[PDB]
Each structure stands twice: as structure tokens, then as C-alpha cells.
Amino acid sequence: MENSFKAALKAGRPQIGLWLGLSSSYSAELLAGAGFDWLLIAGEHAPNNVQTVLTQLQAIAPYPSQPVVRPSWNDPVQIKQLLDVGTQTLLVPMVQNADEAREAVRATRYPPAGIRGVGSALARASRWNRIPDYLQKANDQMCVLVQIETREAMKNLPQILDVEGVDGVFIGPADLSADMGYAGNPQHPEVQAAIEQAIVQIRESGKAPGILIANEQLAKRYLELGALFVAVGVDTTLLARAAEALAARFGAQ
Amino acid sequence: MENSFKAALKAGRPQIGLWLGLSSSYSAELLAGAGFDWLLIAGEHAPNNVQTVLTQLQAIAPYPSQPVVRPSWNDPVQIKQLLDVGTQTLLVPMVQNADEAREAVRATRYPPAGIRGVGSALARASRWNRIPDYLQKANDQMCVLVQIETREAMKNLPQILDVEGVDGVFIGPADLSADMGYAGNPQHPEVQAAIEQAIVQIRESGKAPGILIANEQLAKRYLELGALFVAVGVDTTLLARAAEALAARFGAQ
């Protein structure tokens, strides 16, 4: 039950990932075997809620790729249910300040370190009580990644970085540039500068920087700056671009 | 990607609608072809969440009837996901004051006009980036309808009507009469008076009034007073009343 993604970050080994906007456990498995270090379960139209995350985690389980799940916000209930279904690494959206970061962390840890409920029923997280000493071991294997999406969050980064249990800080270029006044234009120099310096700052604090970047050369640049969890594509972009390129090779006839 | 429902309201053409309490994309399509101007996706037992709204929007898409979606409350996350799946007209429940109305509006608009996230993945809203200049065009095509359900909301109507981006104000007779002390008795004169004068007041402010009314003559009355989005029935009422009337024609034998 050791979290290998968390251990890799801690050891400074960079992890290359793919963002999943589809909810299918079939495509999840198809992608789990494609050679990524991690996959981000982030679908915005999931049909079966936590059960959708269950089947994606089951699909991914036997593969080397590690799952990370993005709840739709920093929601203590959502977090509790994702941890019970067996999620060990979370990407928590819209973390704006250190208080919010500390709340995300506390939601993942049993008392006294946090407020995670032991609950009434057996859960997949403990493999139905088959993992020996699960209660004692669980806290140390939770990996909390916080997403910074605004000027305000960027402003508060040194304090967020000071929060114990924040293992990583993920920057979403699209949302940040929108908030900076360049929506759709993350490549604008002021935006790239802010991202580069955040990535360096996170790394210098002994925490893992993450980012999503579909431009392959930019991704490489972030990796050199020390980004340790880098999503380099999104499943639905891969599919849409491949399909469009294929149809264009023939034109509509 | 022009919102024809929003344009019709703006132009003062009244829109006749049906409330959908069933979640089926099959019944949605069956109803989409029945000749209504708009359909309200408002099911309270939807199985597949945003994915349920996806399949209803897909069912309705080729028909003249326009979809409006009612999130279960004024929930920034819910709103973001409904807009990403392609919803352009929202009916936001339990708007009690102008602050809440302004928050609903801001949730639907990209920065700087609002807080809508550009997000990380392609979305159905932009048809996966196939709508040219989607980011630049989206804000103007969002249509926000706010639902007033209480004495407090009715009290605050002049201020709600003053909120930029509130395109329409919908009155729910059942809930309002309950709050006024006549639960189940919306036909009580004091209640009808409050509704009539709200409808006139909304219209006089240059905004669209909406209401749900299953009594055909009352519906016509509201339309004369200037109501511009009037739901005249509910799918599950149509079905239950038709079935009961049919069985009664034969009696149990």
C-alpha cells in the first residue's frame, strides 16, 4: 500500500502523465498500458460518480502507471469518499491560500493528524481490512497536490508551500493566464515568466511542481526547471487531433 | 453558437416550454419534437449526473426546441460543469438577493467579466475548439435566468432586476404560495396578485419573466401580462394524468 507516486516525487524522479477527460474504464485501461508514469482522473461528465472512479482505479491497478484523482473542489465529503474507494493521490482544485491547503491535507489524515473519518463499513482503501495495520499506515501514504489557478493563489504560494502535507503544487497555465488578463494566451511572456518562477520557487522549497502542458518543447523546459509531475497531453485532445488529421488526409469525398 | 433562446427573450417573443422531470434522453427527444419552444432539464432523480445532461442536450440538439438546464442550486462547480458540457441557458434556483444573482452571473462568464474557468481539457461547449473564437464569443451567449421562490426573494426583486447579466426571473407559484402561507393553494387571491405584479414588474424592467403554470387559461393570462418564458406542463404530469384518465375509461375489470 506504499504510494509509489508520492515516493517518486519525494525522490525527485520526474513523472510524465496524461490527463483523462473521458470517464470510460475501457479507455482508462487502454491508456494505462501506453507507458505513462501517472494518469489524472479528471473527467467533467462522469456518469457514475465515485463508482466511475472505482472502475478507473480497478482498470489502472495492475499497470505501472499511478492514478491521481482530481475532486471537483476542495470538498471534505468528496475527499472522504475518494479516499475510501482507494485514492491515495489527490489533485485538489482552486486552493487559494494556506488555510485551504491545510484543510485539504487534514481531510486526508485520520485523527489526531486530521479529520478523516474511520467510518462504519469496510472500504476498498483498506482492501476490506486485509491490509495489516491500515489505520496506522494510511496517513503517511496520502499524497496531496494543490492546484493554483489564480493571481491570488500565486500571491499566497510561499505560505501554501509552508503547509505540512502539501507534497506538490500544480499550475494550470490556462486558468492562470485568464486570471492575469490573457485568456487563451498562456504563451504571453509575462505569463510564462510567472509560471517559470513559480516552478522554480516550488522546487526550491523542497516540494514537487506540476503542470499541464501539451506543447512538447515547453514541457521539456518545465522538466529542466525542476517540474516533477508533468501532464503532457489530454486523452480527448489526442483523439480529436488524430481523428481530424486523418479525415483531412482524405478530405470529405 | 448563438443562443436563440436568449435572442428570443431579448426580442420579446414569448417561448412556450415543458418542464422535464424524467431524465431519459429517449423521452427528451420524443418531447423535443412535440413543438415546444424550450424544454427545461430539471430531473430530480437523474442517474448519470452531467452525463445525463449531455445525452439530453444531444437528443434535443437537432430540434427547434431550445434546452434550459436547472442546476440543483447556485453552485459554482455545478455551473462550471454544465457550461462545459454545452449548456448556454441556466435556470438558477433559490436566488434570494442581488448578491446571489450577481454570483450566478459571474459563474457563467470568463475573466475579467466573471470567474468561469477556461479549464485544462477541451470541452463540448467549444465543440472541442472547433467553434472559432469561442473564448471571445462565449460570455455574450450565456443566458442566466434566476428563480425566485420566497417572500424574501420577492422583497429583493427590484435589486435582483438591477443585476447586469440577469436576463430573466422565473416565479415558481407552488413554492412562493407555500412561503406566503398558502401551501398547495397558489390560486388564493393574495398569491395571484403577488405573482401578477412581479410579472409586470419584471417586464417593465426590460427583463424576461418566466413561470410554470399547468392551467391553460392561467398560462394565457401570464402571457398577456408579458411573461416571456412560460412552461405550460411537466412531462411526468402529462403521462400520469393521461394514463389515469385512460384506465378510468375502462375501470379495473
Place this chain on the structure above:
Amino acid sequence: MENSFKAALKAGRPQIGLWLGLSSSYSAELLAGAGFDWLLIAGEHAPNNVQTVLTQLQAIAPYPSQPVVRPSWNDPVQIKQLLDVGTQTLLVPMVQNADEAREAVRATRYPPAGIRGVGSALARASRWNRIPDYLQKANDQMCVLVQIETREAMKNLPQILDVEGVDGVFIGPADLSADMGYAGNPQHPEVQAAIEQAIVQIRESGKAPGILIANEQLAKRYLELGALFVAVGVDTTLLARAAEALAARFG
């Protein structure tokens, strides 16, 4: 675990029904409380297969309306699964001759009366072995209705009527009229005559005639001639026509 629909037919009490083309257990429950004697689970776009039938049966269970299920054909494996999930009355499509009617009957009965498998797991049908003596009681509570849809089936009707275990014979006017040369027009006198003569003949043999008919006058006509399970409308027709009429009043 008495099959009350089956007993009503046997007693000559007519049963007024509604055909369900939607698969939803929510609409099934909404309709189960509307006053019909029976509901026909016949959806052609069901999402969950036997599981969808399970939730419709569960929805209907506490109401007076009795369920009847139409498998998509006379498929012994489909019939086995529907019986295991708890179906006791089947409307079996496209029964063309006495051999096919006998196969449908044998599919519903445990040996030696039929080929129904006792199976390996507990099943909802026996309420997980909570119905005492289920294996011994089950056969007599199965109710098999065969659907006649072609001129060929009409020709073989006398033989079908001689099949023991056939409790009912259901006539589908639209398909029959198409087979007869009047697709879309069951109102033709030749179609009506075949239908009405069949009803008389079925009842004469001591079996239940059934039919789907959305025209109230024709429905009362068939009832007068002795029909015992008459489906008088379809859920999706009710909804579509009510919606269309409503929108029209504001147009």
C-alpha cells in the same frame, strides 16, 4: 406466489392493460399506480437487459397491477433468465405454429413437464429459496401468452389452441394487417374480420384472447366479443400525444 393475472384470465375476468415502451423503473412505478390491471414490459431500447426487467418488476411489485414481460423472441435462454429474475407471465412473440407454442410452454416448466433449468445459484424467482416448496409450486403459476402476428399463425390457430399450457393468445393488429396487405391500416374490414373471428375462436377453446388497441370503441368491441387481456394504450403514445396537444394549444 399465486399468479393473480393468470387466475383472473382463468376466471374470465377481463384485464385492462398498458404497454410499456419506456424502460425506466420510475415511469414503470408512476404507471403501476394509475389503475391498470396489468402492464406489459415490452421496451425495445432497454439499457440494462434483464437488470432493467428486475427494476421494473421491483417498481411494480407492491401495486395491484400485474406485470407481463415480452421477451424479444421465443428464445429459451432469454425465457430462462426472465423466469429466474421473477417473471411469471410471458408474452412470447412470433409464435407461428403449435410446435413453437409447445416450445414456449416447455421452456417455462421444470422437468419432467419442461426443460426449465433449476440452475446453480439462488434466484429472485424463489425469493432466494424463501418461498416454501417453490420447485413444486412454480410450474402451475407460469402463464404463457403466445403472440399471433401473421397469416401463417392465424392458419395454425386451431392447432395452437390445442397446446396445453397456452393460457392466452394475443393478436397484434398492426403486424397482422401488414402481413395481410394493409400495412398501416388495420381498420380494413378484412383485417377486423380476421381479428374478431380469432377472438371468438380463442375464447371458445377456453383460452384468453388478448390484443393491443388504442381505439376505445374497438377496445370495447373486442371486450364484448370475449377478449380477456386488452392493452388499451402505450406509455410513449400517451406522452407524445399529450405533449403535442399541449404545445398546439399555445400555437
Place this chain on the structure above:
Amino acid sequence: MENSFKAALKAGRPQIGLWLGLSSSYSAELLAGAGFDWLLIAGEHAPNNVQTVLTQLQAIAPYPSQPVVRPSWNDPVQIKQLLDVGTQTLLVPMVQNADEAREAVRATRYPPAGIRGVGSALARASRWNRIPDYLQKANDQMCVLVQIETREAMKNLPQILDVEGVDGVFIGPADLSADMGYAGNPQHPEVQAAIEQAIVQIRESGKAPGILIANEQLAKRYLELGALFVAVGVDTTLLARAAEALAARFGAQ
């Protein structure tokens, strides 16, 4: 539409229950016939949300066992939708103080006694308006059970017990012992003492105590102390323990 579970509690007849962590309406029905007085719909990975609760309520309806539903928190929207789908007894999690208890109660009652919305569409709760005078009868048949899971909640118990409409108070041993500093060790004397005295205190206030306890002798002890809704097992524990015991009788061969 009389709530027989609520009436049994009121009359002091103890109700023996099973906690359902599976969401299947098939297993729900299989368990509904097993001889329990009540079943707790509490699955943490439900696929179809309110629709999942619909099919479980439909499965259970013809059986003597009575359904109770645990929303994932004291969420006015969640509560409204569960009541509309026909839930009459709720177990509300994480009630910490009397204000929260009063809010849970008010969420279940139509105005003026509460804030429950009459709503726009017919609902399963009224059996689509077929229950005569439903609006007038509904409030009295709602049964609110509040879950106390912390030292803070235990501290506030006398005030929670003073709230009109709180019919019962449920103690979750696992969560309480975790909060007391004995996570995984509810059998610790100080914890058992706190639970025993809460059970007596609830009962002495004329309200129903509830608890979940899988140890059969401990369960009997709580029943003697006056606990009136006692869940004595969890479906997924029954299955996991039975399967493990069976495989062990043969060993892997």
C-alpha cells in the same frame, strides 16, 4: 404513508437493522427479505445517485423491513431530493450541535414548520399526488435521526436532544473512538463508558438511541441499555467474512 419505523421508535419497540454499503437494488431486495426491521442505505460508491436510492426504495417497498437513508452530509439539497424520491427516515451525518440538528429537521418540513420546497413537478413522495392530503400529512411522518461522531457532538448532546423533531441520535463507535484518541480501539473502557452513558442519556430524554455494532454480545448490551435502532452488521462485512471463511476451509489448492 404512515412511517412505521418512526412509530416503532416512538412506542419503544427496538428495531434491528443492517447497514448497506453495496448500492445494488438486487442485493437490497435479497437483504430486505432476510428478516431485519430496517435497512440503512449508506453506500459510498453509488453509481446513479438519487436514482440508486429510488431503485433500492422500490426493491424494499413490499417487504416488512423499513428503509432509512443516510445522505452524505447535512445538505439541504440532498435532503430535499431524497425526500422527493420518497425517503421518510433520514440518518444525517456529522451533526455537531443543536443548530445543525434544527437545520436538518427544518429541511424535512414544509413551511411554516420548515423550509422543504413544495417544488414544481409531481414527486414519488406523494405518489404523484395520489396520497390524499399529502402536503398536510407529510411533516408528521418525517423521521430525523442525527449522527454524533465527535467529542464536540457528545459535548453538545443535551442541547441536540432538546431539538424538536430530532427523533433519534445515532452513535458511531469507530469515529467517536478515533476522535477520543483510540482509533481502531472502540473497546477501550473510556470509549465504551462514553457510549453507554450517551445511550442512557438519549433514552432518558424520551428519544431513540441508535448505534452500529457488529459484535453480537455488545449489541445485546446496548439493546438492554435502551438503544432502539441498532444496526447489527454491514452487508459487505457479511459477504467478505463468509467468503474468506469458506476459502480457508479448503485452502488454496
Place this chain on the structure above:
Amino acid sequence: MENSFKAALKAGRPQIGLWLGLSSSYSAELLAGAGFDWLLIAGEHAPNNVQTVLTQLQAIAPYPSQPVVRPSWNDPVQIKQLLDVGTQTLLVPMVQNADEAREAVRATRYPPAGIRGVGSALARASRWNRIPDYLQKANDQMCVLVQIETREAMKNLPQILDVEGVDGVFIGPADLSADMGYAGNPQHPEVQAAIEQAIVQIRESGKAPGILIANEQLAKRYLELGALFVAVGVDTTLLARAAEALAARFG
């Protein structure tokens, strides 16, 4: 309710397509807007059966791309349900001889041209009776494509080509090459020769040749020889290969 795919084939306009192995209506819509003339609904793990086909058809409806559905075999009941949910072009698997091709055609046509049942309930196919004269117009808008997958089917090709109502003949290179002794290697000259000769022969008879081929050069070769419905890739191959190439660039 004109079948535009069918008219294009008839007019000799080639149609470039994509094969869908995923069942999602979200990915179906994402692909429907990518520029193909047609999409083949062929998923082998569909969750909701006919209902899954319903949501894919609904997703695709407003786009220029035309849907074609592949039932899992030449199953009259499966074909009836797909037609009722609104399918107008079918790719029918494992058609081995002219008798099987005729059965597939008759399954799609109302009497007296075929055995398609008019049915009891309204269906999406007629848009719930909103398409005027649907019963009279439907037969001529059905488009039947038969899939040839074996040496036996190739031997009977001349006869299959004589079946009225067969609008198209689809060659599946992987299965044919396996039947011929080269499983996994359609590139063998003997396989290519059989494929190319068949294409010429099909077009010669005034029917549309079709084929799935992910190799662009071969695809252009078949088009040059007169193929009219060419599926040039599969959704799951596109995704798997793009994902794998992407991960590799960072390895």
C-alpha cells in the same frame, strides 16, 4: 428522411469513414465533428445495447457525418430493434452466401417486400409518427451493406452481387487473410489480389465496395480501384497509438 449515405454511394461519391470501437456518445460526438463522411457504430463492449446505439445516433444526428451500425450478426431481431431505434444503414456481418444476403435485405423491409414488423408502439424510426407516410417511404431509404469475411463468401460473391437490395459489399481484410492462411498478414500478395479483384467486381455490378484499411497508401489504392465506403482508421487505434507516441517522446 432521405438516407444521404445511401444516395452518395448510388451517385458514386466515395465516403471516408471511421470505425468506432468505443461506445461512448461523448466520443461519438467528438468524432462526428472531425470531418468524416460516415462513422461505423461497431463496439464490442457496449454497455446499454440498443440504448447505447440510441445515444450514439442522437450524438451524431446534427452533424454531416452519417451513421452506419454493425449488428453483431445477421440476427432479424437485432436488425428489427436497430431499425426501430432509427438506424437506416446496416453493415451485416458474416454474410456467406446469397441466401443470407437476401435474409438481411428482407429483414429491413416492410411486407410484402420483406419481414420487418410494423410493431405495436411508436418508434424513433418514424419520429413517433411525425414523418408523414413513413411506412410507405421507409423501405427505399434502407441501405444494406454485407460483410464478406471468408473464402466461402468470396466464392459466392457473384451470387451475392445479384441480390436486389444489397447496396454495398464490405471486405474485412484481417478476417479474410486469416481464412486464407495468413492470419495477421493481409499484406501478402494473394490476399491483396483477392481484395482488389473483389473491389473491381463489386463496382462492376453497380454496387458499392467497402473496406476498412488503416494504411493510407492502400486506402488510396482501393479508392482508385473504385471503392466507395472506406473506413480509414479506428477510434481506439488512433487513441492508443497517439498516447503511446506521446509517452515515448518523454522516455
Place this chain on the structure above:
Amino acid sequence: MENSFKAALKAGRPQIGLWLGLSSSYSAELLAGAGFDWLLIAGEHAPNNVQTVLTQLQAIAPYPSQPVVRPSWNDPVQIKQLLDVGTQTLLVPMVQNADEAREAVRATRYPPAGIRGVGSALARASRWNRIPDYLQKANDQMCVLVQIETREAMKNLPQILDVEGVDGVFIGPADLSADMGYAGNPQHPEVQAAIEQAIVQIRESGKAPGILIANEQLAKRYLELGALFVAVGVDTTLLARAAEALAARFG
């Protein structure tokens, strides 16, 4: 992609199993970690068809327990789809004679050994072509178990045992005892004798005998006689009986 269940049978190592009547991938995973050598995916009310099998296989994949899937009958199309989604061991129902056993075997093997279609799309079975030489390795890792359920099948057992590719013969006591005249009572000496003689005979031919038996003593008896895949309980029986016993202790 070694089939480890198949190798265990071949090596004469007995495999203790559990029959799954529930379809849930959550309960499938909960049971996959309970200690069984194999689990039988046999649900009769599955909601998602092949997709439901996909999520159960995915749930089970990382555990030591090996999955075996029971198609609802000896249906080549059903077998094709289950193999494509990744099933390597099939329990094929109602195999009555050697011809039917051979058909089941040929359905699982690529030409020229069988009729399994290579197909058009990538499939989970080959892990989307990530298993090297999958087409060449697949046939030898398929494991076909035939279910004998009638006196007729018992009569033909010697011939069935001569079919190459039949790795195992599974006896279903409830169905056999019903066919023999003792429905509900497999305990009868005549039934037990037929079962035990069959087990000896199967093992003698160098094939694996299998059986479902919830009685521990009988299970050990069959194991002693040489049975190699013994399912010793059903998930829904375990749950129902545990729940009932629990409620009873408080009654």
C-alpha cells in the same frame, strides 16, 4: 499471457472457486481478495453485458484468483465478444454431445484451428497489440470447460471426452438431478452415483472434472475422487444465509 488456471488443471492441482451471481465489479474485487483460486462470472441479471464482464475482469486482474466466464449458451458470437474483451477460460453451458463440444472449442481458436475472427479493431485480449505475437500465442492459452447438465450429455460423455481442446467437464448437480427425476434433491444415491462415476471417468481421460457443490463434505468427497475445479459456494448464497442467520440471532 499464460493462462495459469489452465496450467494448474493440466498439472493436476485442484482449484477451489466461488460462483458469482452478482454482477458488481465492487463485489467481484471484494471476493477476488478472499482467497479463492478462481471465480466464476455467471450472473443472470447483468446490466452492461460484455461491459459488465470487462469491469469484473479489470477488478480481478491484479489478484491471484483467476476468472472464468460462463456465456449464457454455446453462442459463437457471445464467445467471440468474451474472448475479445480478454476472457481466456470459458464454461460453456448445455453441451450435450461431442459436436457441440467441438463447436465450442473451434469458436475459441483462430484459423485454421478454429473459426475465431481476428476482427477489425484492436481488442483488450491482445492488450491492444501490446502482447507480442498475440495471434500466434492465443490459441494455446484458451481453456474450454463444457458443462454437462442432462442424462443425454452424460450418455455422450465418452465422446465429449475424446474432443481435443476440451480441457474440463463441469457437472451441474441441480440440473442433472432434475433431468434424472429428482428435482431439488441431488442427494439421491442415483444422482450421486452418476456424478461420482463421471468424475472418475473425466479424470481418467486426462481432463479436469469440475462441479459446484456448497456442501463441504461432498466437496471434499469429489476432490478425493479427482475433481480439479470445484466451486464451493455462490456469492449470493453466502450473503443471504449470513444475513438471515444474523437477523435470527436478534429475533
